[PDB]
Design a protein around this motif. Structure first.
Motif, PDB file in Angstrom:
ATOM      1  N   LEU B  26       0.745  -1.187   0.015  1.00  0.00           N
ATOM      2  CA  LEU B  26       0.023   0.058   0.182  1.00  0.00           C
ATOM      3  C   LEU B  26       0.906   1.214   0.046  1.00  0.00           C
ATOM      4  O   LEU B  26       0.494   2.272  -0.623  1.00  0.00           O
ATOM      5  CB  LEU B  26      -1.022  -0.196   1.218  1.00  0.00           C
ATOM      6  N   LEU B  27       1.924   1.241   0.523  1.00  0.00           N
ATOM      7  CA  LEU B  27       3.032   2.383   0.724  1.00  0.00           C
ATOM      8  C   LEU B  27       3.408   2.437  -0.408  1.00  0.00           C
ATOM      9  O   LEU B  27       3.907   3.691  -1.036  1.00  0.00           O
ATOM     10  CB  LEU B  27       4.077   2.067   1.931  1.00  0.00           C
ATOM     11  N   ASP B  29       1.808   1.753  -3.773  1.00  0.00           N
ATOM     12  CA  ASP B  29       0.869   2.057  -4.813  1.00  0.00           C
ATOM     13  C   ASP B  29      -0.244   2.954  -4.472  1.00  0.00           C
ATOM     14  O   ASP B  29      -0.528   3.610  -5.452  1.00  0.00           O
ATOM     15  CB  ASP B  29       0.335   0.402  -5.462  1.00  0.00           C
ATOM     16  N   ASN B  30      -0.749   3.092  -3.308  1.00  0.00           N
ATOM     17  CA  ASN B  30      -2.093   3.576  -2.771  1.00  0.00           C
ATOM     18  C   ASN B  30      -3.415   3.243  -3.359  1.00  0.00           C
ATOM     19  O   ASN B  30      -4.592   3.204  -2.957  1.00  0.00           O
ATOM     20  CB  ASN B  30      -1.904   5.302  -2.842  1.00  0.00           C
ATOM     21  N   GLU B  31      -3.356   3.170  -4.862  1.00  0.00           N
ATOM     22  CA  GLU B  31      -4.510   2.871  -5.584  1.00  0.00           C
ATOM     23  C   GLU B  31      -5.251   1.581  -5.479  1.00  0.00           C
ATOM     24  O   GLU B  31      -6.275   1.220  -5.579  1.00  0.00           O
ATOM     25  CB  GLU B  31      -4.328   2.842  -7.061  1.00  0.00           C
ATOM     26  N   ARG B  32      -4.310   0.587  -4.743  1.00  0.00           N
ATOM     27  CA  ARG B  32      -4.758  -0.858  -4.356  1.00  0.00           C
ATOM     28  C   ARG B  32      -5.584  -0.871  -3.161  1.00  0.00           C
ATOM     29  O   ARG B  32      -6.046  -1.937  -2.845  1.00  0.00           O
ATOM     30  CB  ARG B  32      -3.615  -1.796  -4.086  1.00  0.00           C
ATOM     31  N   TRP B  33      -5.710   0.233  -2.395  1.00  0.00           N
ATOM     32  CA  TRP B  33      -6.338   0.354  -1.374  1.00  0.00           C
ATOM     33  C   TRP B  33      -8.072  -0.147  -1.155  1.00  0.00           C
ATOM     34  O   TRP B  33      -8.389  -0.834  -0.351  1.00  0.00           O
ATOM     35  CB  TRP B  33      -6.451   1.545  -0.654  1.00  0.00           C
ATOM     36  N   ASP B  34      -8.726   0.184  -2.269  1.00  0.00           N
ATOM     37  CA  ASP B  34      -9.943  -0.067  -2.555  1.00  0.00           C
ATOM     38  C   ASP B  34     -10.233  -1.774  -2.674  1.00  0.00           C
ATOM     39  O   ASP B  34     -11.133  -2.278  -2.085  1.00  0.00           O
ATOM     40  CB  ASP B  34     -10.454   0.337  -3.812  1.00  0.00           C
ATOM     41  N   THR B  35      -9.102  -2.211  -3.307  1.00  0.00           N
ATOM     42  CA  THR B  35      -9.283  -3.868  -3.354  1.00  0.00           C
ATOM     43  C   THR B  35      -8.774  -4.692  -1.715  1.00  0.00           C
ATOM     44  O   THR B  35      -9.576  -5.409  -1.540  1.00  0.00           O
ATOM     45  CB  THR B  35      -8.217  -4.496  -4.393  1.00  0.00           C
ATOM     46  N   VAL B  36      -7.765  -4.203  -1.392  1.00  0.00           N
ATOM     47  CA  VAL B  36      -7.339  -4.517  -0.180  1.00  0.00           C
ATOM     48  C   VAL B  36      -8.201  -4.270   0.933  1.00  0.00           C
ATOM     49  O   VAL B  36      -8.615  -5.465   1.781  1.00  0.00           O
ATOM     50  CB  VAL B  36      -5.922  -3.824   0.272  1.00  0.00           C
ATOM     51  N   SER B  37      -9.008  -3.151   0.917  1.00  0.00           N
ATOM     52  CA  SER B  37     -10.064  -2.799   2.261  1.00  0.00           C
ATOM     53  C   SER B  37     -11.354  -3.790   2.108  1.00  0.00           C
ATOM     54  O   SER B  37     -12.190  -3.889   2.843  1.00  0.00           O
ATOM     55  CB  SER B  37     -10.470  -1.232   2.150  1.00  0.00           C
ATOM     56  N   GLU B  38     -11.348  -4.569   0.581  1.00  0.00           N
ATOM     57  CA  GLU B  38     -12.526  -5.449   0.511  1.00  0.00           C
ATOM     58  C   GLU B  38     -12.129  -6.874   1.347  1.00  0.00           C
ATOM     59  O   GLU B  38     -13.160  -7.446   1.685  1.00  0.00           O
ATOM     60  CB  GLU B  38     -12.877  -5.596  -1.089  1.00  0.00           C
ATOM     61  N   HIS B  39     -10.922  -7.094   1.324  1.00  0.00           N
ATOM     62  CA  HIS B  39     -10.533  -8.395   1.961  1.00  0.00           C
ATOM     63  C   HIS B  39     -10.204  -8.060   3.418  1.00  0.00           C
ATOM     64  O   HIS B  39     -10.711  -9.130   4.120  1.00  0.00           O
ATOM     65  CB  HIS B  39      -9.474  -8.913   1.157  1.00  0.00           C
ATOM     66  N   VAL B  40      -9.341  -7.201   3.894  1.00  0.00           N
ATOM     67  CA  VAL B  40      -9.115  -7.102   5.290  1.00  0.00           C
ATOM     68  C   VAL B  40      -9.812  -5.868   6.146  1.00  0.00           C
ATOM     69  O   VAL B  40      -9.877  -4.962   5.357  1.00  0.00           O
ATOM     70  CB  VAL B  40      -7.424  -7.028   5.253  1.00  0.00           C
ATOM     71  N   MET B  41      -9.712  -6.059   7.433  1.00  0.00           N
ATOM     72  CA  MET B  41     -10.139  -4.960   8.339  1.00  0.00           C
ATOM     73  C   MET B  41      -8.770  -4.969   9.169  1.00  0.00           C
ATOM     74  O   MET B  41      -7.765  -5.759   9.500  1.00  0.00           O
ATOM     75  CB  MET B  41     -11.314  -5.484   9.048  1.00  0.00           C
ATOM     76  N   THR B  42      -8.936  -3.678  10.110  1.00  0.00           N
ATOM     77  CA  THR B  42      -7.800  -3.619  10.945  1.00  0.00           C
ATOM     78  C   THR B  42      -7.730  -4.644  12.080  1.00  0.00           C
ATOM     79  O   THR B  42      -6.233  -5.151  12.340  1.00  0.00           O
ATOM     80  CB  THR B  42      -8.047  -2.249  11.673  1.00  0.00           C
ATOM     81  N   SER B 100       7.894  -6.106  -4.315  1.00  0.00           N
ATOM     82  CA  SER B 100       7.056  -6.673  -5.326  1.00  0.00           C
ATOM     83  C   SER B 100       5.389  -6.205  -5.214  1.00  0.00           C
ATOM     84  O   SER B 100       4.882  -6.230  -4.050  1.00  0.00           O
ATOM     85  CB  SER B 100       7.035  -8.042  -5.283  1.00  0.00           C
ATOM     86  N   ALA B 101       4.925  -5.814  -6.559  1.00  0.00           N
ATOM     87  CA  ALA B 101       3.518  -5.435  -6.578  1.00  0.00           C
ATOM     88  C   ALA B 101       2.856  -6.264  -7.271  1.00  0.00           C
ATOM     89  O   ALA B 101       3.431  -7.438  -7.727  1.00  0.00           O
ATOM     90  CB  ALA B 101       3.559  -4.180  -7.312  1.00  0.00           C
ATOM     91  N   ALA B 102       1.400  -6.315  -7.363  1.00  0.00           N
ATOM     92  CA  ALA B 102       0.527  -7.412  -7.989  1.00  0.00           C
ATOM     93  C   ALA B 102      -0.027  -8.565  -7.239  1.00  0.00           C
ATOM     94  O   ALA B 102      -0.696  -9.470  -7.424  1.00  0.00           O
ATOM     95  CB  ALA B 102       0.746  -7.610  -9.384  1.00  0.00           C
ATOM     96  N   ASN B 103       0.924  -8.656  -6.206  1.00  0.00           N
ATOM     97  CA  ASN B 103       0.491 -10.028  -5.099  1.00  0.00           C
ATOM     98  C   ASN B 103      -0.173  -9.596  -3.851  1.00  0.00           C
ATOM     99  O   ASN B 103      -0.253 -10.224  -3.079  1.00  0.00           O
ATOM    100  CB  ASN B 103       1.915 -10.576  -4.870  1.00  0.00           C
ATOM    101  N   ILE B 104      -0.479  -8.059  -3.686  1.00  0.00           N
ATOM    102  CA  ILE B 104      -0.903  -7.557  -2.433  1.00  0.00           C
ATOM    103  C   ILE B 104      -2.280  -8.158  -2.228  1.00  0.00           C
ATOM    104  O   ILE B 104      -2.437  -8.306  -0.950  1.00  0.00           O
ATOM    105  CB  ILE B 104      -0.916  -6.136  -2.599  1.00  0.00           C
TER     106      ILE B 104
END
Ligand SMILES: Nc1ncnc2c1ncn2[C@@H]1O[C@H](COP(=O)(O)OP(=O)(O)O)[C@@H](O)[C@H]1O
Ligand SMILES: Nc1ncnc2c1ncn2[C@@H]1O[C@H](COP(=O)(O)OP(=O)(O)O)[C@@H](O)[C@H]1O
Ligand SMILES: Nc1ncnc2c1ncn2[C@@H]1O[C@H](COP(=O)(O)OP(=O)(O)O)[C@@H](O)[C@H]1O
Ligand SMILES: [Mg+2]
Ligand SMILES: [Mg+2]
Ligand SMILES: [Mg+2]
Lengths: 450, 447, 118
Positions: B26-27, B29-42, B100-104
């Motif tokens: 996330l540090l 790319d920033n744009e991947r937050w929308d996808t990551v936020s759908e899978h994980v919570m704090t 590495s990106a795209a594996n987040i």
């Protein structure tokens, strides 16, 4: 004398291996996951010498087969779930594997080295097993030990037989197509490109018996099935320098030879059997024998219940002596056996058919296999034999390149105007047309004429 | 002390590496937050420092602010939480250890999976505690409590990534599908062009994900018809055509293709009696085929559905997809696990090919033989029942096409040179029949 | 006998909870979805064993009470020819009185007869 065995034990107990190549394969896959398809064609998990590398590679295989991205973290988590991470050297060792191979595009070369080392490792293992069997036969005779040695060595060779066959692009097929056309154009093609059948009408349709073809000759009993196949063998033996190999599973070699003598000499088969041969009959038989002995291009194996492996083994033995074979004839496909498939006759016959086709391609020789038509045909008895009559006996149609049926109207209808005529029906043909050829059947001579 | 500690596993399931990769990613790319936020919570993070860091990431990105090492460090410093997470050095280490990106998204799934198991263990302990100390609850109440807590865990992971089942999800996918169809030229063909106008009018082309069964009696031109579909796909599409020729060799398929595209007598090609005109046509056709290079021919015998799938994926990866997959004879394939039953073996092959069609989003054409019982009747056109006797393949097929030639059964038929293509089954179109001109000399079907 | 059965049920529940806890701590190569399915299967097995325990005795007095209760429920609900789920076809509802609760309905047809459509 005390310093001699320590150096010998260290140099002899370590089998051939390449830890560097193994690390490069693993490290390379961690760098570029897309290369798995190519690497998986060359190496298997068991190809790795090192236990830690086998466990790591097994993890790589499982992740990539599942379509998951392969990275250092994913692989470490996979190994941790199975409590195998400590067994491979920890996360640090996985990181070291990814670090020590910064070069890509050479992963295929490393995969070949790992596979080559595994091959030599298996060979040494087999040599030790054979040596152990030789020292301790455990009730096995010399013939059994020889068969065991041949089987284990053949298994090593078979594993590395068709290893890189996956990619089949149009450029490669075009090159092979043109090479094939070029070879046909260089050889005299006066209507026959393969092994001469001895029947002009049949050659016009088949262009001869092609190399790599599995030919099924099927007929009801007494239709002259063995007679027809033997005329093909006789013609191949008289026209080719390479030998003809006959696996007579039903009839003895003496009987096949007597029928051959009746055919080539045009002497009554009954006269040969009864011994009532006149001066003319003896002169013809003698002349025929003189030619057969001059040619020496025919082998007859009358062993019963042969396995496809035994058939292949004997064929290779003879082929090595002459640089190839002209034709392989297997008397009755159904008489062969497959010890691994005794529980299912249909599957057993299907495997025999597949094995014979593989044999035809392996030695680049036409393989003629005789088959019986299903009993259901006699219940119908209204039309000529068809492919469905053979499907009921082991699905042999799928593997055959050429299917020929023998039909004699005089057998079903003694008052048929086609007395002495046998119809050869082409039921299936990959490199030519389907149809029918009429041949003169001379039962007295066990011969088919054009 | 160590023997009891080694045997006792007090550490719940976790993946610090996956947690670090999510934060580090996330540090980057920033744009991947929308996808990551759908899978994980704090709360999905095991580590206390990672929860605080992730909370900071969430707050900055939700506010539309750029997420970088400095911004995150300042955010944590304002709340006096920077020392609690390991300082600026640890934040810098998190960004460094995941280049590495795209594996987040994969790491986010691992973190979520671990959190799920962590919650499950917590619930199991609560149920065990309730079992040991029922506090006045009867067995039925404890069973209901256990069912409720386990159902709550399952409900949280019900509809995580779009959740296909509810109408809102189906509406979104419906509109996306309509949008895709409208962007592509739809002059009566929405899938792979068949090359036959009358057939395209009924089928709208060969659709992606469809398992197509082409069935015919011997010599009806079954291989010929399927190959014309392949030829048309190869000439009209950029993506490659993959042919699994289990019965015929690659050389023979190519020779028949040459006879078809060049309209040169197949017998002439076989015999080599080609005139100047014949050579010019064959040569021109070859030039085009070589220029396109969009066709693969696999002539390996007795292939398993797994091998077919493996080779198809290999080729698809090189071109970003496939235009069409043709499997010469379904019955020639093998399933080592189902050798005891041919019907079940064929049924599994049919199911596997349909799964392959959906997996790669490609039309899969599979050739099949009609049952021998049809010849005993020989009074009407082939029907679906003629195929059911050979492995119940009808249930899995999206489209079933039969080939019927009246001239084969009746040589004096007025329909000489005409082949009828019968649509026996169609999921996305009508059933019926299409008449095609069968040119046996050229191994070709024309409209 | 009921007390012994109840205790056995709680004993099995504790045993399953420990098995699930052990699986959670040591997944042995199982993913979270597999562990969730395993937990659901083991808990469902406990519930299924105690599903129809006292069903043996089926005397006429009990059947009469359930019969009258069923008739009473039908009479309370609007029965204008449909007592179950409306089929949308009047002629079909006249014969079936709708799609009844607890019914297993088999719709069978040859291919392309409109089976999925119906
Ligand atoms: N002495 C003979 N005189 C005439 N015809 C004979 C004589 N011996 C055998 N035949 C004929 O030769 C053929 C032998 O058939 P064969 O090939 O051995 O059987 P199958 O078709 O089962 O393999 C038959 O048609 C039989 O009538
Ligand atoms: N040289 C030729 N001239 C005319 N027609 C031919 C020629 N070779 C093949 N054919 C025709 O082409 C067709 C080949 O059928 P095919 O697709 O291979 O069989 P199947 O339906 O079993 O898959 C047949 O209709 C056959 O009559
Ligand atoms: N575009 C269309 N136009 C007309 N009729 C169609 C169309 N698409 C499908 N049909 C018809 O809809 C029906 C679909 O049948 P279906 O329920 O899917 O098969 P099954 O009975 O095997 O479950 C068939 O009767 C078919 O003729
Ligand atoms: Mg014989
Ligand atoms: Mg074919
Ligand atoms: Mg349906």
């Amino acid at each position: 004398n005390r310093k001699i065995p320590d150096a010998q034990v260290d140099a002899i107990k370590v089998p051939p291996h390449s830890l560097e190549a193994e690390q490069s394969v693993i490290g390379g896959l961690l760098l570029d996951n897309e290369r798995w398809d190519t690497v998986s064609e060359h190496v298997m998990t068991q190809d790795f010498y090192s236990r830690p590398h086998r466990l790591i590679f097994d993890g790589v295989k499982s992740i990539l087969e599942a379509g998951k991205p392969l990275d250092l973290i994913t692989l470490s988590e996979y190994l941790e779930q199975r409590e195998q991470l400590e067994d491979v050297g920890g996360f640090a060792y996985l990181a070291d594997l990814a670090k020590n191979t910064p070069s890509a595009a050479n992963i295929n070369a490393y995969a070949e080295i790992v596979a080559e080392r595994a091959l030599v490792r298996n060979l040494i293992g087999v040599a030790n097993e054979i040596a152990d069997a030789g020292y301790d036969p455990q009730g096995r005779n010399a013939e059994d030990l020889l068969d065991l040695a041949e089987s284990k060595v053949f298994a090593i060779a078979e594993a590395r037989t068709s290893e890189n066959e996956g990619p089949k692009n149009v450029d490669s097929i075009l090159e092979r197509t043109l090479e094939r056309i070029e070879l046909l154009y260089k050889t005299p093609q006066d209507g026959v490109t393969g092994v001469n059948t001895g029947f002009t009408d049949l050659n016009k349709k088949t262009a001869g018996l092609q190399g790599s073809d599995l030919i099924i000759v099927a007929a009801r009993p007494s239709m002259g099935k063995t007679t027809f196949a033997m005329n093909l063998c006789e013609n191949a033996a008289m026209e080719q320098d390479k030998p003809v190999l006959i696996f007579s599973l039903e009839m003895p070699a003496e009987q096949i030879m007597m029928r051959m003598l009746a055919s080539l000499s045009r002497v009554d088969q009954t006269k040969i059997r009864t011994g009532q041969l006149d001066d003319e009959d003896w002169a013809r038989i003698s002349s025929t024998m003189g030619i057969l002995m001059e040619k020496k291009n025919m082998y007859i194996d009358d062993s019963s219940g042969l396995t496809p492996t035994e058939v292949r083994s004997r064929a290779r033995r003879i082929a090595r002596e002459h640089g190839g074979l002209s034709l392989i004839m297997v008397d009755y496909l159904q008489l062969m056996r497959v010890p691994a498939l005794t529980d299912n006759r249909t599957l057993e016959i299907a495997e025999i058919s597949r094995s014979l086709k593989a044999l035809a391609k392996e030695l680049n020789v036409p393989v003629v296999a005789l088959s019986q038509l299903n009993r259901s045909l006699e219940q119908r008895a209204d039309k000529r034999p068809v492919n469905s009559d053979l499907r009921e006996s082991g699905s042999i149609e799928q593997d055959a390149d050429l299917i020929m049926f023998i039909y004699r109207d005089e057998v079903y209808h003694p008052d048929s105007p086609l007395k002495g005529t046998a119809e050869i029906i082409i039921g299936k043909q990959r490199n030519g047309p389907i149809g029918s050829v009429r041949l003169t059947f001379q039962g007295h001579y066990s011969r088919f004429d054009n």
